[PDB]
Amino acid sequence: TLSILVAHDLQRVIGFENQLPWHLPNDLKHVKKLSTGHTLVMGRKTFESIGKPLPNRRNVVLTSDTSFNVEGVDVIHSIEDIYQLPGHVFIFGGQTLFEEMIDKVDDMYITVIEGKFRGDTFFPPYTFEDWEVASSVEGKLDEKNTIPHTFLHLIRKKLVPR
Ligand SMILES: NC(=O)c1ccc[n+]([C@@H]2O[C@H](COP(=O)([O-])OP(=O)(O)OC[C@H]3O[C@@H](n4cnc5c(N)ncnc54)[C@H](OP(=O)(O)O)[C@@H]3O)[C@@H](O)[C@H]2O)c1
Ligand SMILES: CCC(CC)[C@H]1c2ccccc2CNN1C(=O)/C=C/c1cc(Cc2cnc(N)nc2N)cc(OC)c1OC
């Protein structure tokens, strides 16, 4: 199974200066819950932003850099390598990987950040005409999580006659 995992705001901003534009601990917990025991595939810039592999999942980094070798990280050099990965694979970011993969994935786990942030990187446009809402869950707000957000699980719709 191949999924996208992403947080984007009302204008599909996902990043600014190689960081998340928002501080939202619950979304990172959401991410942890979904991906534990599975595989993350991420672009090189996304990896460098995080700075270390996330524990208790397979960390796969896509890069053209043949010198890339980081302890606890598997490296691939082509999109086509993604399909050889076993198990449940999450496309983890960033913009380049989402653009390359949005037409290929089975489904998407999207956190809609219900705000408008300054960004320099974006999730590609998509339409709910093509995507069934398997679930939509409002994130709970508290002292440490102050931005309204919604967890979407979207599944690609089949093209059928009439
Ligand atoms: N909000 C979210 O859910 C979320 C999630 C993840 C990331 N982000 C944000 O996204 C932004 C980064 O996105 P980005 O597009 O600038 O960078 P990125 O996708 O994280 O990484 C880009 C790099 O990935 C490698 N790559 C991508 N496609 C490749 C291919 N077909 N073959 C070989 N290598 C390939 C290249 O590495 P080399 O240049 O080393 O070859 C490329 O320069 C940051 O702002 C980050 O904070 C947001
Ligand atoms: C530190 C708290 C948490 C969970 C307690 C911590 C963690 C700790 C232990 C075990 C697992 C995990 C999983 N997570 N962490 C991270 O430290 C990584 C976050 C992260 C993640 C992304 C990609 C991303 C974010 N959000 C959504 N919805 N989709 C995505 N693909 C980008 C980023 O910076 C561009 C990130 O660094 C901010």
UniProtKB/Swiss-Prot annotation:
Key enzyme in folate metabolism. Catalyzes an essential reaction for de novo glycine and purine synthesis, and for DNA precursor synthesis. Belongs to the dihydrofolate reductase family. Pfam families: DHFR_1. It comes from Staphylococcus aureus. SUPFAM superfamilies: Dihydrofolate reductase-like. The lineage of its organism: Bacteria, Bacillati, Bacillota, Bacilli, Bacillales. Substrate binds at residues 5-6, 27, 49, 57, 92. NADP(+) binds at residues 6-7, 14-19, 43-46, 62-65, 92-97, 100, 121. GO terms for molecular function: dihydrofolate reductase activity; NADP binding. It is an enzyme of class 1 (oxidoreductase). Its EC number is 1.5.1.3. There are two DhfR isozymes in S.aureus, this one is chromosomal and is sensitive to trimethoprim. This is Dihydrofolate reductase. It comes from the Bacteria. Pathway: Cofactor biosynthesis; tetrahydrofolate biosynthesis; 5,6,7,8-tetrahydrofolate from 7,8-dihydrofolate: step 1/1. One of its GO terms (cellular component) is cytosol. GO terms for biological process: dihydrofolate metabolic process; folic acid metabolic process; one-carbon metabolic process; tetrahydrofolate biosynthetic process. The keyword NADP applies. It catalyses: (6S)-5,6,7,8-tetrahydrofolate + NADP(+) = 7,8-dihydrofolate + NADPH + H(+).
